[model samples]
Structures are given as C-alpha cells and as structure tokens.
Target: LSRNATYFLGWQEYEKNPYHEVHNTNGIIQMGLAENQLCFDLLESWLAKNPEAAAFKKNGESIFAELALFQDYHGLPAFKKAMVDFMAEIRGNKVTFDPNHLVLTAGATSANETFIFCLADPGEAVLIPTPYYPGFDRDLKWRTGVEIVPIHCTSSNGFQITETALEEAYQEAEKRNLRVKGVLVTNPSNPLGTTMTRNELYLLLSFVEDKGIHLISDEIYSGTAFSSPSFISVMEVLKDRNCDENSEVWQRVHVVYSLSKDLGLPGFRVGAIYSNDDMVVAAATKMSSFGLVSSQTQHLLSAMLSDKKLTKNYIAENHKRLKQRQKKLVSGLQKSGISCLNGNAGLFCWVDMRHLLRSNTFEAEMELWKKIVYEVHLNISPGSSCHCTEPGWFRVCFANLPERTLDLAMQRLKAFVGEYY
Candidate 1:
C-alpha cells in the first residue's frame, strides 16, 4: 500500500469525530494496564508519604533484602548478578558473564538504536525480513542512514525465513559491495506473531556466522509463546553447542530484550543488550555514556528484577489473558469463514482479509480498512502499514480489549465480512 493509503487506514478525527467508532489500536492489554496501575499505586503511595524526597530515590530496603541486588551503574555488583540470573533463566542456559557485557538501556528501542549506531556506518545495509516491525526501518534510516533491504517473507511457509532466502540476500548485498552489517529477527514477531523455531534460529545463525556477519535478535516478546515451542535466544542456542571465544558464532550474536511487554512496565523503559563480544558491549557502553535513561528508572528496573516471584507471576498472568483474547478473536474469525494465521506466540493474529474483499482480490487492502472503520467502527492496524508485502493480510491485536469487547468486535467484524462476501 502507498504511504497515504497506509496512513489513512487508521486515520480518524478525534476532534468532533464524525466517522464510525472503533476500539483503539489492539496492542494495549487490560491485564498489562491493570498491572501498571498496581505499580503506579505503589509508587504514588511511596512518593506521597515522602513528598520532599529526591526524585532519584532508590529503594534501598528492597535491595538490601535481596542480598544479591545490583542497582548502581558504576558498581552494582548485586544488580548485575540479578540481571545475569534473569538472562540465564530466560535463555535456559548456565552461561556466566561479567556485568560489563550487559549494558542496560532505556528499552529495546534504545538498545536497537545503540547497536545499529555502534556497529553500522552511513550507507550500510541491514537485512530485515519484510512484514517486519515498521519501527525497524524508520529507526535505522533516521538514526544512522542505514538502508534496509526488504527480504520477502512468504506466507506459504508460515512466514519463516528460508536458507535460500538468506543466501540470496547476502549475495545481492555482495553484488553491491554494501556491508550487510546484521540480520534482525524478532522472536514471537511483532505484527506477524510468528516465533522463530530452534531449527530456524540455528540455520540463520549459521548463515550469518559463515559470512562473518552479525545477528541481531529482538526477543522483546520472549515469554509470549502459546501453541509453539518456547522462544529461544540466539545467544542461548550458541551457548548450548559449547560455542565460545574460539567458535565463529560466539562474537556474531547480540540479543535485545525489554520489560515492556511481558513485565507490563513500558513506562519504566527498562531493557538490556546481551552479547559476549567485548567490542559490542564497549560500543553500547559508549552510547549509554550520554545518559539516555534516568538513575531512578535504572533502580526501579533493578528492583523489579530482584523480585523473581513477582516477575514470574506477572508474566504468567499476562500470558493467560493474552491467550484468552487470542482464542476469542480466532474463534470469531473462523466462525465468520475468514481465514487467519493463528499466532502461536505474541498478542496478534495476521489475518487474511481476501474473503471479505471484492472479487476476493488481493489489492483490496484499503477496501478492507475502509469497511472495518466506516462500517463496524472497529479500529485495527492495516496489513499494508505493517510493512507486509502481502496486501490481503492485516494484523489484529487481540491483547488490547476486554474479552467482551473482543467478542463484540469480532461479531461486528463478522457482520462486515458477511456483507462484503
């Protein structure tokens, strides 16, 4: 879809609005909001009682109780251990590393920008799978002048990256002599919600390693797996094969993670970049030296990490709520005879709107958008805006609404589809 078409798909006037009313974009989940409310309440109460306290106040009591807390940036030994422990648990690895290798950033976005800026130069190219998170393209171009080579992801293979596809992309980059700095893959992918399988991760890593290229793995939605196998990090897989300093893959993998999704703490803006390569960590640290995040946010993040039980419970609740909403959405679409790709992980389903489009034509991407917004008053992200080359597919966020709202939205969507069909 053209830029205007993509922009207009979700466009509506909030000031004296006249169009049909639809729910907001689907990424906002009530469960996550509720948890945020709880965190807010706790913070508010603490601040209220100590109105004169410094804004950068650290919760020392919580840290002391944990015994292994690492809160300070300069020498937070305990907090560093906590972070390392957390990474180990998620990666399902026993790998140990010094805190210097971990550079906490504002969030995954900052981590991504830092990695790109540190490693890539102007006019360099980063190979990204199409139908990617739109922000990836925007960030790279805006920050470092790095061009994105859109590698086609076929729906026929459930949007998995193929070995042939990777080889061709590298070959094309080689033809131009443009440095293919890194290959970025989002686990439990944004928009598409397709988690990379273990085999896929290994194959991609091998491909990158063979070419001496970097592999940037965005694992922001690491714990959102539903029907698929649990998400695996590139580092975790590399560590498993006993790869180390002598191994080719050891220096080529960098993983990015955030507390925004599964932890329900986007406002806190806490995330980290994990890589064994000293050069990568040094680059990230240089970027962090500019002080992108506040000391308070760093302390709060360290505190949250210290509470392993709370973190586990928080993720479990989020997964449960998201799965329920996914079921409601998928069931409604199935009943409506609308074909959708079920997301084994993450919060959305990449749905095919062809059945509801005129003559079952694929070019009706905007038609689907117009029908959904003007007729049903249900707001959703258009597939074209999602950076997907496939025009008939659109992403629906199932995690944002209440179950009842999801059910209602589905019914309305089904009715709209019925009329169009």
Candidate 2:
C-alpha cells in the first residue's frame, strides 16, 4: 500500500534538490529518470515550421471548436491513425497496427494499469522479468492488487530472460497459489535496455498459450533501439508465426506504447494499448476516460505525426542521438573501471559495479549506492531498487542530462573511485 520505495524516494529527493550549473552547485545529478531529451530541438523545429498544429487550424482555417467540443473516449480518429503509423514505423513496418483496436490513455503508466485491471482480478499475478522498471510496483500492483512474480534473469546470461527462468517463475507462482493472469514484458526491457530475442518471443507465446493466460508487451522505448539487432515487436513475431486475426494467441497478446520515450513527449501524456481483442479495446476505452489525453494535445500530435517525412527524419535523428549519448556514458564508465551489460536499446545502461561492493549482497549494493548518492553526488538507481536478484548493479540514464553535465557527473564518479578505491 506504500509507494515510498527507494525508487520513488530517489525521485522525491531529486525534485527537492535538483542539480543546476549556475545555482545549486554540487546538487544531486539525476541519472534515475528515463527521459529522452536529445531530440527536443527537432520537435521544436517541427513546431516552428508548422504553427498550424498548435493553433488548432488546418490550412489557416480554425478547427478549435471541433476539438474543444469533442470528448470521446475512443480518441480522435486522426490521432489514432497517426499513432498506429508511428508505431509501425518504429518496428520497421514488419507489422501494422489498426486504429480501431487502439485504446488511448494518458501515459504508459495508465495504459499498463488499465490492462492489469482488464486482464486480472484482485490478488491475481503477472510474471515479469527481473530488473524491470521499479515504478511497476506502483503502476501495476499498487491500486490493482496484482502481484508481480519475477522471472529471475542474471548477469551470467547478460540478464536475458530464458525458458528456465520463465518456468521457474510460473512454478513459483503456482507454489504460492497465485494465478498468473499474464506475462508482462518491456520489449527492449526498461532497466536492462535490451530487446527480447525472437526465440524468447516464441517461448512467451508458447507459455501463455499453454497456460491460457495473456501477454502484455510494454514497448514505450521501441524507438530508442539505437544499435544493431534492431527492435522487434511481439506483434512482428506473431505475424511471423502466421497467427491470423482469430488466433487465440493473437488475441491474448497486447501491446502498450507511448510517445513519452519515443518522441520525448512525456509531458504530453499520450499512451495507448493495441490489442486484437475487441472486448479489451472496448473495456479499456471505457476506463480510458479516467486518464484521457487532452483533446487539444491529441489534435496537435495528430498533425505533427501525420507528416511522413518529418516522422521519418525524427526517428532516424533521435536514434542517432540516443546511440551517441549511450556511447558517451559507456565510455565514461569504462574510464571509471566499470563495465555495463551489453545493451542495444533504451535510455539507460545496466551498469556493473560489483567490484565496488564490499560483499556480493544487496546490503553491500545499498552501501555502494549511498556512497554514490551522498558522497559522489549522483542519484542513480541501484539494481535492488528494481527487484534485481543480483547485487552491485545500477541503471544510469544518459539521455536526460546535457553532455557537459553528464561529463561532470562522470568526472565526479572518476574522482570518487580514484579517492576511495
């Protein structure tokens, strides 16, 4: 019932005393927030070049009245259409999304919670990979009372989810007398920053089909796959297996997506659920009224994402910038005698600081984290905060900070290591 996990506590600490160059020198530098700020300039340029979007006009003709009066839970047609196209583009057009099957929510947080509400009852559980986003505790389980049973992944396998881990999680859930309603995953996982392999997808489908449960693929960071072995959606895997519209497995699989990470538009509060089940679409659509994206915001984004060339250019440029930022962070960590898990996607690195721990335990990881926070002045998230079974790992975000500030944070880390160890 309490949301004061270390993860949220770190965020609260950040808000109370955030870093600034000119003011608040030596303040806590934020490496916990998964924000993509590298492509704001591109968005700003698009906005500047297309003023009609924000002004609620089409070709200089006012349409503000229509948007203001429209308050349908189904969302604007144009926005849903554009959103589906954007999602398809991100997945390299391997599969396409239908606007009618999409349910718009305020953010991925709400989309996830809504799906949990739809798929499971109170006291039911979902299987998730270890080291998932810490916020899932609050987002999926806090209000819905759905339990999360982790499929423990290890650095021994680069933290990749495996069949043994999946079966272990299911058995664990069974042992606890909990019915697992679904297997929720972040393709291009949140804390791990690695996409699920094609074989993993097949395994998940088999697991869900065998168990008669559902699979929720949270893909908000699909666009930030900035390296080789490009992002693959569960939808693509379904298509590859020749699952048609009426396939039970097809209907059981759902996708959660948002423009927050993809477009650096978290402030806009746009997230969606794409599912093949008509009942789910209807049910989530009704629940979506509680967290509907403002009609005005939807209208503006519909126009912005409708521009094919602009969307293409933004995706390419954003991925390039994310790749560059990740490279800088990886190199900086290397200089500090740290190595991260080999990752291809997401905004943060799964850092390995095991050698820095006094002992191979979560307690030692906490001690190291406190030293990093209070002594080193960086507010990074420890692996324990994200339910990681292993110790001395952390998720450090690189995209949220400016290059110079990131460099400063790295320098502070280097200094800390040099002085302490």
Candidate 3:
C-alpha cells in the first residue's frame, strides 16, 4: 500500500485496471496530483516550431546521436547553465543559482532521496513540519534507512512555525534517543500552500546553525507560487546570514528542485540539488549516476530554459493562469460552504471537511473521502495520507484540469456537499 498507495487508492476507489488506467467513462477527475496543465498549450505550440532542439550540435557534430555513450554525470555545460539561469529567473532574478553547486537527478523524488542518503546515516532522523507531502515517506526513508520526524504545526495558529516548535521537536527527538541530523521543508508547503517568511527562514537557519544540523529546502514548486510576488531561496538568506567567511550554517543548507511544477514537465525526470558545501556536492554527484536524466531530455530542456524571452513570458503566463485556476476552485468550494486554510501558492489547497464528517474521527474522515471519491466521482487526496494532524482536512489540487473539467469538478463537489447536508 505504501508504494503508489495514493495512486492505487484512486484507481481502486474508481475501479480501474491495477496495471493500466483504462479511461472508462472518464468517471473520476483526479485532483490529488499537483500537475501544472495550464500553460502546456503555449509549450505545445513552440515545440513544433523549435525543431532544432533535437539537433546534437551547433556545428553539426551529432552529440545527441551519441548520447548513449556519453554517461557524463556532470551533465552538459549548457544544460547546467541553462538550468541555473532558469531557476534564477523563476525567483525574479534577485538571487543567483550556480551550476557548479547543482547535482542532477530523475526528479525531486530522487533529488530528496539523494540528499537524504548523503546527509544522514542509518538511524538518523530529519525533522519536517506536518502536514507534509506523503510522498516524502517513500522518497526520503523507504530505502535510505533514515526517518522523518514531524514538527507538528497546529491549525490553531494557522500552522505558524516558531522557534519554540523547532526546539520542541528537536528536544523531543533527543528525548526519544533519536539522532536528529537534518531539518527538511517543502517551501510553498505541499498541503498547506504556505510560504515561510524571511524572518521564519532566518529562524530556521539559526536553528540549524545552533544545532549543527543540515537544512534541506524542497523548492520544487517555486514557480507555482502565483499569489506571492517573490519566492525566497534559503541560499539568499544564507548569504545574508553568512556575511563574513567561516559561516558554518551556509555549508549545511541544501536546495532540492525540479522542472515538474515550474515548467510543467513531470515526465522529463529532471531534478537538481544545489548545495554550498563542496563535499556534499561531490558525494551527491557520485550518487547522481543512479538517476541521471537522459541527455536527450536534458537537451530538450536546455533549449526550453535558455531562451530568456521565452522563459520570462512562459513564467509570467504560467503564474497568471495558476492564479486564475486557484481562485476559481477556492471560490467554488467556498460558495458550497467549504472553508479552506489560507493558501497563497502551489497547485493544491487544504480544505476543511470537518463539518461533513459523521464524527471527529479519522474513521469518519475516511468515509467522507470514500463518498467524494466513489460517489462524487472525484479523486482528491485525504490529508491523513499526507501526515496531516487533523482528520477532516484534505488537499484538493486545482491546476490539473481544463476549464470545463474544473467546472464539472466544482459542480460535483457542490452536489456531494449538498447530499451530506
């Protein structure tokens, strides 16, 4: 159940093939996945015109043909530079991202696991705030002999993370005789869609600095933050903190990112790890061989990322569309008498289904999720699967479907709520 548990749950709740998703009646619209389907239209239009992306060389040498032999773990120089520029541009070009600091992987899934393998040894734990992405359970700890300890942020305070919470979690780990080696976070959080403020980020840096542990920031959804004007990277905060040399904290902070959410290319298998510590990069680079993205895919991305004007327009349009879709979904849910947590970014938002629960128990929550999935004909994620502390919270993805499809989803959602009432 752990492997593809969410996926298979949706598959079974709707009763489809275990091996293949045979589109029978298109009965269920899955809003559980954080896929950016809005701007693919623009990208699809460009792909036909930019036929040279498949070409191997500027001088006609055919390197793309020999991509099979070139098992270069460092990746092509252009690919790295393009990704660096693309990442910086996505963050408003205020901070710089270096190609030398990056190690390539298949996706953020692998990027996170690679960092976990490099930073923590067996029996060591990484502290993460809840509710978080359930995928991390499989990605970070499934095969790595590491564990994720929850920070247990509460809804009473709008899940505000404070110094007390950090220390409390750290002390709890110490009390349990757990070796806390690192702290992990998904900026523009998965379920909550919250962005950690600059002050909050500094608090995190100070905590990691004091504890002499690592800070792994998963910024894979950096570009999907539509409502926020700026997305701050831990690197920018580190530079501010480590004004002078010998900044020990700067050495321990790492960023995990991918082209999936930002570029709407989940199928490409492109993910990156950017670390300030040279040794960490060196070690992770060696680990990269296991999941290095194909050069052909890298070549395609290099072209997509390097076109400055194209990238700028693409990013702007992507955010605009995401904002539009998010508003549509949230407003629809609100009109149906469903309240959601305050969220500014990401493809999904956390909805409160506590009112519809038969009782204040996860058992009641499961029954509600089943009705929504099987009867309502929608496949939204249950918050419990994402390690949510509350039973009635659910993560509903808003950007995966088209306008008409989304309208249909909202109607189904309203109808289901009415039935419960």
Candidate 4:
C-alpha cells in the first residue's frame, strides 16, 4: 500500500526506536526533532531532590500512594494552577493564563489536531506563512481534511510577513473558491527560528478582524526566545491599546503551548490549548479523554512548576544555556562560510546551504539531505521537508544534544559542507 497520504507531520522519515544505522550506537545524535535536552539535568536533579513535592500525603497517605484513577478532563486543579503560574512566569509576567481556559492534550501534536477538528470542517483552509513547521500539514490537514495555503514569505525581507503577502494569499484563495478559515502562525517560528514582530502581529490581528477568521498562534516555543523584546504573545497584542480591537475579536484568537521545548520534556507529553473562548475550551476539554496526559505526569509537574524559586532558576539557566548554544552553532556555520538567518529564539539555527546544494532543485536538496544524514551521521532536517519554497535551507537543532555531542556534530558538519564545496 502507498504511504498514509493524510499523515502530514512529515516526521515519519525520522523517529526514535523505529528505524533501521538509524539505530543508536556509541555516537549517534538526533538533531532533527526539536527535543529540548539542555535543561533536563537540572530538572532531574531537582525532582530527585524533592520527592516530597510530588507526594501529596493527606491523612498521612500520598495521593499517588494508591493506583491512580482517571484524571479530570479539565486537568487536576493543582496541575492547572501550577501550569497557569508557570505560563505567566515564562512570558515575563506580561500575559497571565487563566486555568479555566486551558485544555490539556497529549502533547502539542494532539493539541494542534484537537483545535483543527473543533474549529474547521473538511475542505476548509488555514493560511500559514512559508517555511512553517512541516508537521502542520499532518496536524491541521492530514486527518482533519483541512488545507494549508502558504503565504509565501521571502528571504529578501528576512522572510517577514507583510500585509501585501497576506492579501495576496487571501485573494488567491477567493479566486480558487477555497474557504479560508484561519491564519496559523508560529511565534519564534519553527524552521525560521525567528519571532514575529509587534507590527507583524498587529497586521495579522487587523487582517483577522477585517476578514472575520481565527488566528491560531502556535506559541509552544514562547519561552525559548533568546533575544530582546522577549517573545510577545498574541494575547499581549490583543490587550495592547495600540491595536484597534473589537471585544468579540478576542474569541477568534487561540494559542497552543507545550512543556516539550521549553522544559526538555517531550516524553512527558504535556501539551495545552488556551483560548479566551469558553465554548472552545469546553468542547476541546470533552475530547481530552482520547488524549489526556497521565495523572502521574501531571502530579509531578504540578509540584515542580509551583516552586517559584526552582521555576525561576530553571527558566533563567535554560535561556542562558540556549543562548550560548545558539551563538556557538551560528558562529561555527559562519566560520565555515555558511550563513544563517538572524534568529532570537528556539532550539536550532536555520542554516543556509543553498550554495552547497548540488543544483537549484528540490531533488538536489534531498540529495544533500542524504549525504548529511547517512554520511555526516547527524539528523538535520532539510528545508524542503519543512515546505520551504527555497532549497539549501536546513534546520539543525543544537539544544537536543549535549555540548560534546554538539561539538562532534559541528565537526562533522564542516567536513560535510567541505565535500559539497
């Protein structure tokens, strides 16, 4: 049978514990998936040190002392409060999270699909800027039967999203008779590793208000921004008096968040959907049964997140380490005569390997991906796979590996690029 055509996350080609050299050896490192491993040591150490934090001993009995029952679809109240505080704390205390509005899912994967299913019908469309997260194809459209109409953001202006680009895409969709339902964008974007500007977000807010469509801001990477102005949230813009807003417009905005990237907890499967719309939260919460996180996980995270001292220390240290890694990785590529777009957030640098490509074709990009994957022994994602219109752009994650493994990967990267040159 042919591949599952609807499976769009596009990460099928790269997964752990399911491949054939693809196997782990003494030295294999995966930089393809945006897994955050940088702050894991700290988390493990802290958790180990505070076993009592997770132990809810009531009447001299730990709540987890017994075999767990099912979790509340809305999530444990303690878990909700902890998550709310953590979310607010990370956003630099600018945007506050209301626990009632948060819906828990398996991870961002389930969080994304749940929203898609609830909001749009089959044959509807979402406008995503170019060079977006490849997984959105699978997350939004594959099974949900939605379509992604890309708003082509070019490299000429740093891939900035302009009002013109938005209108062009909107008019194009109208011509094609496709029902444009929403604009789904990544803050501190995935492949781009860039944050949306205040003006750009305002432009989107205005456009959505004009068109009367939803704005799904994938802010899973919110706390990962390593630059100034910090990572701004759509929630921030909605509250800003600078933007003209109708009270009803806030209902159309939603955000997707996860502990995976910011907390190095992919295995924890903590993903959430937040919205100002009560109906959206209520509906998504009912469906949470199919994708509810383990009570055990929720219990543990609730304790750790509520520890303000620990939370502050962890977030601060994580950003510091990420900035260091970001600088080194970009500098290494630059030293090798390669260039990357200026990015202030996220775990990886989007490397420009267009010149190193065998030719100016998607086929050439895959060929280079093969050499980098098989020969160089690193799992860097090709830009073509990410649906980047241009070739020679690859996302190489640095936070996934340790300093030593990163150094080894960099050495391999230089040699691989040398062969291409």
Candidate 5:
C-alpha cells in the first residue's frame, strides 16, 4: 500500500507528537479522526447495567462454550436479527431489512471491499462522489484492485452529486477502457457532513437504472443525523418507489452499515452488508469469512441492541448530544471569523478556509495545512486529502474530544486567525 498520501502524512505527524492534558500539553491535538466518542458514556452505562452480555450468560447460564467454539461465517442468528432492527430504527422504520439478506463483516472496510469484489472484476471501476472518506483509497482499491473514478462535486450546490457529473465520470471511465461496475456514495457524507437530499438520491437511482449499473450506499453515519432533513437510506428510496421483490433496481441497490460511527464502536468491528438480491447476499456471505465479525462482539452487541428501551433512549440522547456539539463547533468557528459548510450530520465539519489561501491552488491549501499542524498544533484533514475538487476546505472532527479540549482547539484556531486581522 502506498502510505505516502497527505492524509497518512498528517496522521504520522500527530502520532509523533500527540497531545495530552499533562504529559504533552503543547502536543498536536487530533481533529482528523472520524470517531464518534461523544456518546461513550451512554454505551458504558448500558454495559454497566448489563454485565451478562459480556460475561456470556443468559438467565445466569454460561454460553461461553457456544461462542468460543468455531462457528460458520453466517454469524449469530440473534445478532443479525438485532442488527437489522437497529438499522431500521435508525431510519425511523421507513424501510425494513430482512435478517436473511444481511451479511456481517469485520468492519465497513471489509463490507465495502467484499461487496465490490462480488460486483466488479479487478480492472473495473466504481464511481464515487468527491471529498469522500480518505480511507476508501486503501480499503476499496488496495486489495480488490478496482479503480475508483471520481464524480467530482464542487463546493457550489453544496457538493451534491448530479446526473451530469455521473455521466461525465462514466464516460471518463469508458474512455480509459475501464468498465464501470457501480456507483458508491456516503449519505450524511464524510467530509461534507450533510445528508443527501431526495433529489440527489433520485438522480443516482435514475443514473444507475439507466446505466444498468449497481449502487452501493454507505450509511455508516445514519444515526448521526442530529438535525432536520433526517437520514434517508437508499433502501428507503427503493421501498418508496414501490420496487418489489422482482424489481431490477432491488437487485442493483445495496447498503453498507456499521456500528463504528453510529454506535461509536469502532473497536468492536461490526459491519454488515444489506441487499435485496438473494444471490448477492449469499455471495457476500461466502466472502465474509475473510473478515467476519467476531462471535463475541456479535453476542455482546446483540444483547445490547435487543433492549428496545435502551436503543430508543440511546438514539435520541446521542442525537441530542451530537446536535449540541455541532452547534458549539459552528459557533466556535464563527468566533474565529471562519465558517463551515452548513451541516447537520456526521462527526466532522467541512470547513471553508478558502479566503485564507494565498492562491486558488492545492499548494496553498497544503501550505496553510502545514501551518495549522506545525504552528497551531492541530491535526485536521485537508480537503485535497479527501479528493475534494476545490482547495482550502478542511475536515475538523468534533466528536472525538471532550468539551474542554474542543474549546481548546477552537481557541488555538481563534488565536491563529487573530494574526490575520
């Protein structure tokens, strides 16, 4: 893997000099990771209240031997049932997913790769909207050998992917003799932190429907939609269109989900692939052996999510906290004479620092990024690292740190910007 990308480079700098409240007070503060740490207390409380889940006991009887024994790649039945219910709850039950159609993998990284492997050949390409998660470079392409063709979305129109951009990217792939396999999108976008509108979803459906290609909707951040225009999954679009069991679109559309961002359980490595196509589900299930979710994790989360009241309360309370955190971040940036793209979901903000650029070029973006890292001691991601078409935008994650630390990071930025005035 080519680990020389700017994203990895910035992370390396952070690793070398990470911040601490006592030991390394002036070290670099991490704002680049897209981790949802804001709601750990809720999860901790749930775990504390229910120790049987982790202890492998049901009704005070040990189930340790059952899970410790080798199991098939299909995963635990109860876990699949609980996971689908949780996913449906996140979507407000606008769509229903059958546990029969779910394939559990280690993480969204494995789930995405497994699906791409199922759909496309080594040389084929998948069209992705710009400023996507930077890790897609390694996760989707590194092992599968599938090329990623960018459907460039600019800052104008809020980085919404359009039909024209889709066609352009498709043709660009065709010109290079790379067969287009599918289109992949992240709802409640990674860098942008905005949910896709119904119009954008329709455009994608039509594009894929006309092109006879597949659509992979990565909805890992669905539960983080803390504000209006609540999260909508591609599955909901298919259901709303009345696409039945035999519909071609049902076979072509798939969703990738995980508890990493939504439940703030990245360490658990629980990810899944949900599809209507029976064949695809079987195929992905077969491929899942390479990176299957641990039966222990499946057992633990299954118990946690099985509680209806716990999940309902966690979802509402987490959204409330996330909304407040986002508001604080926006307000903090405003205090510094900086601004973010209007956002309602996800863990980070797509900040606009274009006016601070020396010129309209990536070089200037990197120059300013270096200053922020080395001088200001903050490790935020540059837009170019996420394959953003425009320069001077950066993604600063707010959910990973405490309120005091977030304020400190804001203070650093505020002081840095103060030099300009």
Candidate 6:
C-alpha cells in the first residue's frame, strides 16, 4: 500500500480501540447525546407500547404502505415530491426547483460524498476552511482523489472567513489551473460553534460569483445560534440579491440541509440538496442510483415536516438546552483554570490546552488525553483528530450529559488538573 493508505489505515486502527477512554473522539460530544435522552425516552416508550402502530409496524401496512414497495434501483416520484415540498417549507419558499432537482440521499454525508464525486475530477482541488469538519478531508481523500486546499481560519478572528484568505486561495488555484470545483462553508460550525454573519456570507457569495465558482453551503447547525447573531442561509442571501432561477449566478449556488443536528434526529439519516441548476440535479440523481433512501423514511419525514410547528419547537428546545449546558461547561472549565475558546453556539467548546502542556503541537493532544483518561477518568476529542493546523486545542461537547453528570465530570477534571498544577 502507499504511504497515505498506510497512515490512514493506522489511524483507523487507533480509532477502533474503545477502551482508550477519551471523550469527543467519536465526532460527537457526550453532552449532546445526554441532552437527547428525553426525546429518546419518549420515542422508546411509545414504541414499546404501540408496537402495532402503523408507523411502527414492521410488516409495513398503513398510510405509509407505499414505502414498503419502493425499489432500491429506481427513484420514486412520490418520494421526490414529498422531499421537495419538505425542503421548500423548512428552507423557506425560495427552493423553486422541480422534483427532478431533488436527490433523496441516505444522509448529509452521502449527499456530500456524492456531490464531491460529481463535481471534481481526480487530482482536481476543492477549497475547505481550516478546523473544518474532519469528514470533508477523510471522505474526499478516500472516496475521491481530489486534493483539499485548506483555507486557514483562526480563533483570533472569531473563526470567521476573511476576503483576503478567499482571494489567496483563488489565486493559488488559478496558478495550478486545478479547477477549484467548489467552496464548502459550514455555518454555525462544528467544534468551534461560531456562526458567520450575513455580511460575511454576502462577501463570500460575491467572491464565488466573481470567480464563477460553486458555493456549497452546509446549514446543518442553522438552528443552534444562541447569541445576538442569528443564522443566515446562503440561499436567503442569493434570493435577496435577486439571484433566482432566471439569474445568471443562480446555478452557482447549492445549499445542503440535514434533519440530524437541528432536529435532534441524527439517526434518521435524511438530508436534501437544493439548487436551481437542472444539470446539478441530474448529476445528483445519477449518483443516487447507488442506493436511494427508503420510501418509508420519506413518508415519515413528510409527516413530521407537515407539522412545521413541532419541528420548530424541537429545534428551539434543543437550542435552549444546549445553551444552558454550554454555559455550565464553560463556567466549570474556567473555574478549574482551564482556558478554552468560547463556543458561542452549538453543542461543543473548542478548548486550548496549551497552558497545561509545554509544547504546542498536535503531538501534545494525545498526552493531554492520556492525562485526562488516566488521572481523571474523563475523555474528550483530541485536537489532532480535527486536522487542526494548530495543536493544543481540543473539542469538548457540553450537550450530551445531564447537568449533574457534567458537574461531576467538572469536579473530576479539576482534580486531575490540580495534580499537575
């Protein structure tokens, strides 16, 4: 095997060892899971009592009966319409594309992979921001041969993307003639939990338009904005600028949404992509032939989406709970004398652990994890796993555990840090 293959294989081996005892290693924070227990408990109890209910029936006979008949090979029209309607409602009425414009993928991950595959050629380049979602790098390298050009965004600038940085990346891409297929922007970003403002997004959209490039906006964390700033979708901006189906720049914008993070339905494995371009839709539909999503899932999603109020309620509750938990964790970390970046939104806080270590590099991340595991019996996501350019920073999830559990974890963390202090 090649050196790259060997390195990734070794990393996978290390990832599979469950007894390693570090938190946040799995790409999810323990706190988010803990906060979701109430919803899970409700669902579990309902399932236990109404095992024969139409929605829960394993034999698949009910209003959703058509789902059982859906084939894996061909796309279903009903599913397509349901998805389009659902997307239009949740994303506002600006998704004016036809059913053919929709591709029912298994999840956002699948959609992302499929989109990347459809857009870039082997050895072509895709621009991604630093401290980005790790899946972008892994899936791009493993599934497609495209090279990732990292646009470094730092904690110093509130983790915001700058115009200079975007221009610099574009210049580099121009030098190589590598065809910067698209730029991926993750709003209310994972790990950092920072949301980009409307002005910032508009600047990015303008840059992409000027460069004649595609912009892929990931709005998974749209509902998690907790402060004075609110979430803004790129589609909303494009529409406001009158860049619609008839506009010259309309085809360059594509937005992706998932029911996972905001809806607290991560296991549902449902997501959609919206664009005004017929060709983009055709490519996505062709890619969906690999394994279209279940018809039952589509119907269930439609039903749930029909009650738009319930979805909003769920999102609001999740945001409220996460904000409370985030405050607790941040305060606790501060009281314990650990300095971490303020995660303004979402379920995690990206922390800097350099104060606890002498060296500030990726290598120190494992040492910090070892200390947390051996000394405090607490675990967290190591900064190295994020492919972060700067070392000594780790992500701590505050939404997966109960207040008391987190309180205890904080106490233990304090004790652990005291040992070295």
* Number of the top-ranking candidate, with lDDT as the measure: 2
Mark the regions of model 4 whose C-alpha exceeds 4 Å error after superposition.
1-29, 53-60, 65-67, 242-246
TM-score of 1: 0.83
lDDT of 3 at 170: 94
Is 1 or 4 the stronger prediction by lDDT?
4
What tens digits encode model 1's per-residue C-alpha lDDT throughout 3-34?
Answer: 42444434442222332226444322221111
lDDT of 2 at 72: 97
Model 2 per-residue lDDT tens digits across residues 42-146: 989989999997998988899999989999999999999999999999888889999999999999999999999999998899999998898898899988978
**Each candidate: how many clashes?**
5, 0, 0, 2, 0, 11
Model 1's C-alpha root-mean-square deviation from the true structure amounts to 5.9
In candidate 1, position 5 carries an lDDT of 42
| Order of candidate numbers by lDDT, starting with the best | 2, 5, 3, 4, 1, 6
lDDT of 5 by residue, 368-411 (tens): 99989988899999999999989999999999998889999999
lDDT of 4 by residue, 1-421 (tens): 4345512122443453222233455333577768788887898888787866456543446676442874679898888899888888888888788999999899999998888888889888889999888878777887787888889887888888999999998987887778998898999799888889998998998899899999999999988988765688888888875432456678999999999899988888999999888999999999888999888888778878978988999988988999999998887778778899989899988888888877899989888777766677667788877778888888888887667667777787788777767
Report how far off residue 339 is in candidate 5 (Å).
1.3
Where does model 3 exceed 4 Å of error? Answer: 1-8, 15-26, 55-61, 243-246
> Higher-TM-score candidate among 2 and 3?
2
Global lDDT scores for all candidate models: 0.68, 0.91, 0.83, 0.83, 0.91, 0.67
Where does candidate 1 clash, by residue pair? Answer: 22-377, 69-78, 69-79, 70-78, 70-79
Give model 2's TM-score versus the native structure. Answer: 0.96
Which run of 10 residues does model 4 get worst, by summed lDDT? 5-14
Quote the lDDT for 398 in model 4.
87
